[PDB]
Design a protein around this ligand. Structure first.
Ligand SMILES: *[C@H]1O[C@H](CO)[C@@H](O)[C@H](O)[C@@H]1O
Length: 36
């Protein structure tokens, strides 16, 4: 699972888009999405 303050899954990011329990994949920027 993607860690806190890391990029979870934005446009172009291929990988584990599911964040760790309690952290939410928030799309901050068009490509930058972060697990908060
Ligand atoms: C890998 O997966 C990511 C998932 O967000 C895509 O954005 C990318 O285009 C590729 O399919």
């Amino acid at each position: 699972t993607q860690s806190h303050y890391g990029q979870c899954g934005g446009i172009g990011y291929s990988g584990p888009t599911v964040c760790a329990s309690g952290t939410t994949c928030q799309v901050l920027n068009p490509y930058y999405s972060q697990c908060l």
